Amino acid sequence: MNPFEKGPDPTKTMLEASTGPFTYTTTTVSSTTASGYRQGTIYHPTNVTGPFAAVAVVPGYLASQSSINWWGPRLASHGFVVITIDTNSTSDQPPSRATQLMAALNQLKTFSNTSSHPIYRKVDPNRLGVMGWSMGGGGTLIAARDNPTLKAAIPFAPWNSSTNFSTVSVPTLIIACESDSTAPVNSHASPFYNSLPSTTKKAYLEMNNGSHSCANSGNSNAGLIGKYGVSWMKRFMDNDTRFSPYLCGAPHQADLSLTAIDEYRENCPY
Amino acid sequence: MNPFEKGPDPTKTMLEASTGPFTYTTTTVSSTTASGYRQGTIYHPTNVTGPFAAVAVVPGYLASQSSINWWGPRLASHGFVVITIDTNSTSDQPPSRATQLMAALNQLKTFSNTSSHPIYRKVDPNRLGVMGWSMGGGGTLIAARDNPTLKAAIPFAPWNSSTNFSTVSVPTLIIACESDSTAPVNSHASPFYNSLPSTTKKAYLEMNNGSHSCANSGNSNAGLIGKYGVSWMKRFMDNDTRFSPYLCGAPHQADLSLTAIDEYRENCPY
């Protein structure tokens, strides 16, 4: 038995649902408490005993938590602790966004070690992941490069000046928005994916006609995008091979006829 | 250029005040007069000429006007005609509460056509909305499903036996109470919001640690909650784009930093 396995055996319907099998609640982190980032919101499972793997999520340039926080409930309801952060400045660039992701994860560990905190004992400090939008997606790839003990990375509509992530060894799912005019896939998401070494478990999910906000809060493909983000975090943070079919097997292959997906790349099996 | 726009340009101060810029009065509807609901109280503006959009508000199971009637003064003082109703039986179920919401709106129309009545000519019969608590919030969503000519719907701490509102096309703001142990958000308000179509203008306002009564008369955050209800009815029933910033812009982003709000969802811009 895999000791990290949580929740019922997955199905397509369960993975595409707006919420997973778990109840969750949401705790605010004030600017006074927040260390190394401006402020945040923690989404954590309830009525299920952990500890759980934990994910930090960061927005893009001039953006706030509202752009990215649909990931909080979507992952929390599948047995993850999620922190969505606001950056010290909304003008922060990718390297700064990488530092703030790691600061958020470091504080989750502190909160998990604090008897008074709602998330006391909820975080497995050794099973951590990062996600982010646009320059926060650049920050996600920089965090992965600089912190290779991270278990998973999901940049979405990522933006970064440099395309060289040839040393990244963290399992990385890049979510790309076909029609993106802010972070064009041919200058950002696609070259990032192509740089990753052959030995790094990886995927590229490109959404048909996607604008730059195609994986943001309120998007019209939340069922499909959420199915991939949850499956990625289950497989790589929980080692949960019940989710492998949705990334690499017959369920995955059936997705590739959906008009919503214009392209998918991977180095399956995993 | 918008003939439905009433009153001064909005400010944070004006929107959080216990009353808006208009004076209002009340007219009791006896159980002898009331047609298709038990009885009610009408709240209507007095220092401004209409006609005005109209709203009906229904309570929850076993509950009376007193639980929901704070909305009367708050919305009437912003240029709406509001009827707070008692149901034929306090044991009426959500489909019955939906029928009674519409019967109350229909009688507001009749009174507005009744030369001797205090609200003669005050209702625009083309601009109607619904609100309700708990089973009354279930009723509100059922009314919106079955009456797509409605301009707006505001279920608050809603309860319903079914979560599927995937054909509601009426602009819907769901007000949720995070710690609700009567209509838990994980089983009611959140699934209702998540069922709404992408084409439906919508918002989800969840109050931090809120009990089931978090949006009822005498609640602890009536300035902030009433700001959202007034802004929703202005934006959608008056097509008043002056209120857009309070729902979708910088003032709204400033609210998301308040401890009182644990979650907000929307598909801005509207």
XYZ file of C-alpha atoms in Angstrom:
540
model
C 0.000 0.000 0.000
C 1.168 3.576 -0.765
C 0.974 5.363 2.619
C 0.357 8.748 0.948
C -2.820 7.600 -0.861
C -5.883 9.755 0.022
C -9.506 9.573 -1.138
C -11.550 7.233 -3.336
C -10.236 5.639 -6.542
C -10.406 8.327 -9.289
C -12.799 8.437 -12.269
C -13.040 10.929 -15.159
C -16.245 12.395 -13.617
C -14.629 12.744 -10.158
C -11.495 14.446 -11.616
C -13.510 16.893 -13.824
C -15.915 17.883 -10.966
C -15.573 21.470 -9.621
C -14.624 19.922 -6.200
C -12.897 16.733 -5.027
C -14.118 14.220 -2.418
C -12.926 16.172 0.688
C -14.460 19.074 2.617
C -12.013 21.934 3.074
C -11.814 25.285 4.842
C -9.864 28.492 4.203
C -7.681 30.375 6.623
C -6.409 33.911 5.893
C -2.751 34.897 6.558
C -2.510 38.644 7.386
C 0.268 40.910 6.139
C 1.477 41.165 9.761
C 1.862 37.375 10.037
C 3.106 36.721 6.494
C 6.919 36.381 6.340
C 8.692 36.965 2.992
C 5.507 37.632 1.002
C 2.687 40.169 1.377
C -0.253 38.039 2.515
C -2.048 34.831 1.624
C -4.903 32.371 1.956
C -4.475 28.732 3.064
C -6.913 26.098 1.808
C -6.759 22.871 3.784
C -8.692 19.616 3.906
C -11.106 18.953 6.776
C -12.759 15.694 8.046
C -9.679 13.736 6.763
C -6.477 13.105 8.749
C -3.202 14.189 7.141
C -0.503 15.142 6.941
C -0.822 16.259 3.291
C 1.528 17.486 0.553
C 1.474 21.329 0.275
C 1.469 23.696 -2.776
C 2.265 27.437 -3.039
C 0.615 29.433 -5.897
C 1.767 32.896 -7.068
C 0.144 35.322 -9.556
C 1.652 37.351 -12.443
C 2.711 40.980 -12.941
C 0.194 43.536 -11.493
C -2.017 40.591 -10.376
C -3.397 39.392 -7.021
C -4.604 36.070 -5.501
C -7.995 36.485 -7.321
C -6.278 35.481 -10.654
C -5.034 32.121 -9.296
C -6.986 31.079 -6.211
C -9.452 28.602 -7.941
C -6.472 26.205 -7.440
C -6.925 26.516 -3.617
C -10.321 24.743 -3.332
C -9.698 22.470 -6.360
C -6.518 20.971 -4.806
C -7.585 21.243 -1.099
C -10.775 19.189 -1.866
C -8.386 16.447 -3.217
C -6.185 16.312 -0.055
C -3.540 19.069 -0.416
C -2.678 22.092 1.702
C -2.574 25.108 -0.687
C -1.322 28.654 0.012
C -2.196 31.358 -2.556
C 0.003 34.448 -2.086
C 0.131 38.142 -2.867
C 3.662 39.370 -3.617
C 5.537 42.107 -1.709
C 4.929 44.275 -4.812
C 2.570 43.438 -7.720
C 5.562 44.702 -9.883
C 7.798 41.792 -8.677
C 9.658 39.957 -11.493
C 10.113 36.154 -11.778
C 13.227 35.633 -9.564
C 11.474 37.590 -6.744
C 8.295 35.474 -7.304
C 10.458 32.297 -6.925
C 11.859 33.550 -3.553
C 8.305 34.378 -2.316
C 6.953 30.898 -3.322
C 9.685 29.333 -1.176
C 9.038 31.763 1.674
C 5.352 30.787 1.656
C 6.184 27.051 1.718
C 8.689 27.694 4.562
C 5.971 29.457 6.590
C 3.461 26.609 5.977
C 6.040 24.330 7.657
C 6.251 26.778 10.600
C 2.386 26.928 10.899
C 2.179 23.072 10.702
C 4.658 23.001 13.680
C 2.513 25.530 15.705
C -0.073 23.956 18.103
C -2.364 27.004 17.957
C -2.530 27.113 14.122
C -5.504 25.742 12.146
C -3.043 23.750 9.969
C -1.121 22.223 12.954
C 0.278 18.815 11.808
C -1.395 19.125 8.342
C 1.830 19.601 6.250
C 4.353 16.909 5.272
C 7.406 19.178 5.092
C 9.129 16.825 2.624
C 6.319 16.863 -0.042
C 6.071 20.432 -1.439
C 5.083 21.859 -4.836
C 4.830 25.200 -6.687
C 2.441 26.717 -9.254
C 2.080 30.150 -10.795
C 0.712 32.301 -13.578
C 2.742 34.182 -16.219
C 5.736 35.842 -14.412
C 4.651 33.615 -11.486
C 5.043 30.687 -13.925
C 8.565 31.930 -14.637
C 8.973 32.090 -10.834
C 7.688 28.478 -10.584
C 10.396 27.252 -13.044
C 13.126 29.302 -11.214
C 11.967 27.878 -7.834
C 12.119 24.341 -9.310
C 15.612 24.971 -10.730
C 16.935 26.409 -7.426
C 15.078 23.939 -5.071
C 15.243 20.512 -6.736
C 13.751 18.739 -3.654
C 10.368 20.234 -4.715
C 8.132 17.337 -5.856
C 6.114 19.072 -8.581
C 5.872 22.339 -10.552
C 2.909 23.624 -12.675
C 3.690 26.882 -14.473
C 0.563 28.114 -16.322
C 0.714 30.653 -19.218
C 4.322 31.133 -18.023
C 6.527 34.195 -18.866
C 10.325 34.459 -18.356
C 13.139 36.276 -20.232
C 15.375 33.152 -20.283
C 14.059 29.903 -21.863
C 16.926 27.733 -20.472
C 15.511 25.375 -17.793
C 17.865 22.549 -18.904
C 18.827 21.738 -15.229
C 15.209 21.448 -13.890
C 14.730 17.903 -12.430
C 11.315 18.573 -10.761
C 8.318 16.914 -12.509
C 6.860 19.837 -14.490
C 3.456 20.258 -16.190
C 3.384 23.402 -18.359
C -0.140 24.647 -19.120
C -0.026 26.844 -22.260
C -2.702 29.076 -23.808
C -2.665 28.756 -27.645
C -3.745 32.352 -28.475
C -1.708 33.998 -25.641
C -0.509 37.509 -26.841
C 1.146 38.425 -23.446
C 3.362 35.275 -23.072
C 3.270 33.831 -26.619
C 3.737 30.023 -26.451
C 6.386 30.143 -29.265
C 8.616 32.516 -27.114
C 7.722 31.252 -23.565
C 5.739 28.035 -22.741
C 6.989 25.921 -25.736
C 10.759 26.720 -25.473
C 10.555 26.258 -21.635
C 9.141 22.734 -22.197
C 11.686 21.961 -24.977
C 14.619 22.965 -22.666
C 13.681 20.443 -19.911
C 16.019 17.422 -19.831
C 14.824 14.034 -21.234
C 15.182 12.570 -17.678
C 12.698 15.087 -16.120
C 9.092 13.830 -16.029
C 7.166 16.485 -17.974
C 3.979 17.391 -19.857
C 2.768 20.295 -22.039
C -1.036 20.955 -22.108
C -1.970 23.614 -24.711
C -5.560 24.921 -24.524
C -7.315 25.629 -27.881
C -7.925 29.411 -28.452
C -6.710 30.061 -24.872
C -6.149 33.719 -23.915
C -3.385 34.562 -21.406
C -5.976 33.928 -18.587
C -6.992 30.428 -19.863
C -5.958 28.631 -16.620
C -6.994 31.415 -14.243
C -9.876 31.645 -11.767
C -13.211 31.430 -13.602
C -11.818 29.867 -16.811
C -14.192 27.940 -19.139
C -12.114 24.697 -19.105
C -11.810 24.233 -15.320
C -12.970 20.594 -15.528
C -10.159 19.569 -17.877
C -7.453 21.897 -16.509
C -8.297 20.929 -12.897
C -8.217 17.202 -13.853
C -4.598 17.590 -15.080
C -3.394 19.777 -12.157
C -4.900 17.408 -9.539
C -3.584 14.276 -11.373
C -0.098 15.872 -11.600
C 0.014 16.706 -7.854
C -1.426 13.248 -6.916
C 1.152 11.381 -9.092
C 4.237 13.470 -8.166
C 3.565 14.634 -4.559
C 1.642 11.540 -3.293
C 3.369 9.003 -5.649
C -0.278 8.063 -6.369
C -0.211 5.819 -9.475
C -4.070 5.596 -9.413
C -3.801 8.976 -11.281
C -1.202 7.748 -13.879
C -3.974 6.624 -16.360
C -5.295 10.241 -16.499
C -1.785 11.531 -17.505
C -0.440 8.645 -19.661
C -3.109 5.923 -20.202
C -6.426 5.320 -22.029
C -8.341 8.137 -20.187
C -5.553 10.578 -21.169
C -5.601 9.411 -24.813
C -9.414 9.961 -24.994
C -8.878 13.638 -23.885
C -6.688 14.247 -26.988
C -9.852 14.206 -29.237
C -11.391 17.126 -27.206
C -11.522 20.402 -29.248
C -10.500 22.151 -25.965
C -6.927 20.660 -26.239
C -5.021 21.839 -29.315
C -1.713 20.047 -28.395
C -0.274 17.747 -25.691
C 3.376 16.681 -25.234
C 4.806 14.273 -22.632
C 7.586 11.758 -21.879
C 5.211 9.057 -20.464
C 5.301 6.562 -18.894
C 4.780 7.912 -15.333
C -27.529 58.709 -20.586
C -28.696 55.762 -18.387
C -32.307 56.567 -17.434
C -32.222 53.875 -14.637
C -29.223 55.435 -12.794
C -30.365 56.920 -9.392
C -28.552 59.038 -6.809
C -24.997 60.320 -6.360
C -21.832 58.611 -7.666
C -20.940 55.746 -5.292
C -18.103 55.883 -2.689
C -16.846 53.216 -0.239
C -18.314 55.372 2.640
C -21.747 55.667 1.014
C -21.875 51.910 0.183
C -20.906 50.735 3.751
C -23.335 53.131 5.559
C -26.421 51.502 7.208
C -28.519 53.555 4.729
C -27.864 54.956 1.280
C -28.542 58.471 0.023
C -32.369 58.107 -0.147
C -35.018 58.361 2.555
C -37.468 55.431 2.687
C -40.770 54.490 4.290
C -42.619 51.218 4.984
C -46.078 49.974 4.013
C -47.396 46.809 5.750
C -49.172 44.201 3.583
C -51.759 42.515 5.878
C -52.511 38.787 5.457
C -55.989 39.969 4.239
C -54.380 41.929 1.326
C -51.404 39.622 0.503
C -51.993 37.458 -2.592
C -50.040 34.165 -2.878
C -47.871 34.681 0.259
C -48.832 35.185 3.910
C -48.038 38.892 4.509
C -45.164 41.317 4.037
C -43.659 44.728 4.471
C -42.762 47.019 1.560
C -39.778 49.366 1.853
C -39.780 52.178 -0.706
C -37.818 55.359 -1.459
C -39.447 58.734 -0.696
C -37.026 61.569 -1.675
C -36.513 60.472 -5.322
C -39.005 59.749 -8.144
C -39.081 56.348 -9.800
C -40.060 54.026 -11.201
C -37.537 51.728 -9.374
C -36.428 48.110 -9.787
C -38.189 45.846 -7.221
C -36.887 42.976 -5.047
C -38.680 40.254 -3.056
C -36.914 38.654 -0.019
C -37.999 35.320 1.553
C -36.792 33.662 4.765
C -35.730 30.117 5.572
C -37.543 27.127 7.068
C -39.572 27.984 10.227
C -38.273 31.622 9.931
C -40.054 35.004 9.616
C -39.473 38.463 8.084
C -37.332 39.546 11.076
C -34.496 37.185 9.955
C -34.144 38.843 6.499
C -35.729 42.325 6.683
C -32.478 44.377 7.221
C -32.262 44.183 3.369
C -35.451 46.322 3.208
C -34.010 49.608 4.571
C -30.560 48.927 3.048
C -31.854 48.479 -0.542
C -34.813 50.965 -0.354
C -32.375 53.744 0.749
C -30.465 53.039 -2.533
C -33.563 53.447 -4.796
C -35.243 49.989 -4.864
C -38.739 48.878 -3.832
C -38.315 45.857 -1.508
C -40.963 43.449 -0.151
C -39.936 41.184 2.783
C -42.414 38.291 2.969
C -43.683 35.667 5.373
C -44.538 32.365 3.663
C -48.048 30.836 3.627
C -46.655 28.167 6.049
C -43.282 28.474 7.861
C -42.816 24.790 6.720
C -42.931 25.642 2.982
C -40.122 23.953 0.950
C -37.847 25.710 -1.618
C -40.128 25.250 -4.719
C -43.043 26.849 -2.757
C -40.722 29.702 -1.573
C -39.842 30.285 -5.307
C -43.565 30.505 -6.232
C -44.152 32.934 -3.289
C -41.192 35.183 -4.316
C -42.790 35.535 -7.762
C -46.283 36.085 -6.298
C -44.887 38.891 -4.116
C -43.220 40.538 -7.147
C -46.517 40.173 -9.064
C -48.431 41.934 -6.254
C -45.835 44.713 -6.116
C -46.701 45.199 -9.832
C -50.441 45.249 -9.003
C -49.967 47.771 -6.145
C -47.820 49.924 -8.501
C -50.918 49.920 -10.841
C -53.292 50.724 -7.893
C -53.966 54.510 -7.784
C -54.865 54.476 -3.997
C -51.778 52.431 -2.914
C -48.649 54.003 -1.314
C -46.354 52.490 -4.045
C -48.550 53.670 -6.969
C -46.206 54.077 -10.023
C -43.051 53.219 -8.010
C -42.300 49.776 -9.599
C -40.749 49.226 -13.038
C -42.411 45.868 -13.823
C -39.585 45.039 -16.309
C -36.802 45.173 -13.566
C -37.334 42.577 -10.790
C -35.038 40.586 -8.489
C -35.152 37.918 -5.783
C -33.237 37.253 -2.535
C -33.638 34.704 0.237
C -32.059 32.944 3.196
C -31.335 29.204 3.455
C -34.384 27.298 1.997
C -35.418 30.798 0.780
C -32.034 30.980 -1.023
C -32.859 27.608 -2.562
C -36.214 29.222 -3.550
C -34.289 32.231 -5.021
C -32.207 29.940 -7.312
C -35.362 27.962 -8.353
C -37.148 31.293 -9.088
C -34.138 32.428 -11.204
C -34.118 29.051 -13.068
C -37.871 29.276 -13.878
C -38.095 33.075 -14.540
C -35.162 34.112 -16.747
C -36.653 37.662 -17.173
C -35.498 38.389 -13.552
C -32.628 40.931 -13.548
C -30.791 39.641 -10.431
C -30.756 36.913 -7.726
C -29.036 36.959 -4.272
C -29.276 33.677 -2.368
C -27.652 34.064 1.103
C -26.560 31.024 3.210
C -28.639 29.015 0.715
C -29.910 25.463 1.328
C -31.331 23.134 -1.368
C -31.672 19.313 -1.686
C -30.256 19.449 -5.251
C -27.079 21.337 -6.317
C -27.719 21.479 -10.104
C -28.517 25.111 -11.191
C -26.645 24.710 -14.530
C -29.496 26.482 -16.528
C -29.731 29.658 -14.363
C -28.994 32.657 -16.698
C -29.941 35.445 -14.147
C -26.953 37.395 -12.663
C -26.471 35.631 -9.313
C -24.463 36.681 -6.232
C -24.263 33.819 -3.688
C -23.437 34.976 -0.123
C -21.990 32.061 1.870
C -21.066 31.703 5.591
C -17.815 29.712 5.923
C -18.619 27.923 9.277
C -22.318 27.290 8.419
C -23.404 24.001 10.175
C -27.017 24.197 8.845
C -26.332 24.704 5.127
C -22.659 23.756 4.946
C -20.994 25.602 2.063
C -19.255 22.421 0.874
C -22.731 20.813 0.303
C -24.853 23.913 -0.618
C -23.578 27.427 -1.490
C -20.280 26.339 -3.173
C -21.761 23.538 -5.352
C -24.646 25.910 -6.335
C -22.109 28.551 -7.504
C -19.977 25.889 -9.247
C -23.046 24.568 -11.188
C -23.775 27.999 -12.745
C -22.956 28.331 -16.455
C -19.903 30.321 -17.651
C -22.273 32.603 -19.605
C -24.042 33.622 -16.351
C -22.729 36.758 -14.582
C -21.969 35.499 -11.074
C -20.151 36.088 -7.805
C -19.519 34.123 -4.596
C -18.888 36.046 -1.328
C -17.916 33.806 1.616
C -17.737 35.383 5.086
C -14.782 34.288 7.273
C -15.882 31.946 10.120
C -19.490 32.983 9.326
C -22.381 31.190 11.070
C -25.620 30.330 9.214
C -26.973 33.814 10.253
C -23.919 35.679 8.823
C -26.088 37.694 6.319
C -29.246 37.951 8.431
C -30.700 40.932 10.287
C -28.261 42.033 13.014
C -25.206 40.378 11.436
C -21.651 41.437 12.361
C -20.582 42.803 8.935
C -23.687 44.508 7.543
C -21.715 47.397 6.060
C -19.570 45.091 3.903
C -22.310 42.562 3.033
C -24.798 45.310 2.206
C -22.137 46.980 0.017
C -22.074 43.812 -2.141
C -25.885 43.392 -2.245
C -26.471 47.069 -3.142
C -23.654 46.981 -5.777
C -25.119 43.764 -7.323
C -28.670 45.180 -7.588
C -27.313 48.527 -8.958
C -25.046 46.853 -11.541
C -27.663 44.327 -12.804
C -31.128 45.816 -12.109
C -30.165 49.452 -12.963
C -27.362 48.537 -15.464
C -25.450 51.089 -13.337
C -21.767 50.754 -14.474
C -20.711 53.287 -11.742
C -20.891 50.282 -9.346
C -18.544 48.106 -11.486
C -15.373 49.052 -9.496
C -16.967 47.829 -6.204
C -17.583 44.369 -7.786
C -14.627 44.021 -10.226
C -12.064 46.860 -9.778
C -9.620 48.394 -7.270
C -12.171 48.920 -4.445
C -13.175 45.228 -4.760
C -9.466 44.172 -4.724
C -9.003 46.228 -1.473
C -11.973 44.293 0.125
C -10.200 40.958 -0.642
C -7.489 42.023 1.930
C -10.151 42.250 4.737
C -10.156 39.434 7.358
C -14.024 39.420 7.147
C -13.938 37.775 3.635
C -12.289 34.323 3.389
C -13.219 33.555 -0.294
C -14.476 35.524 -3.325
C -15.248 34.080 -6.796
C -16.455 35.932 -9.920
C -16.350 36.053 -13.753
C -15.576 39.831 -13.959
C -15.742 41.905 -16.032
C -19.565 41.873 -16.218
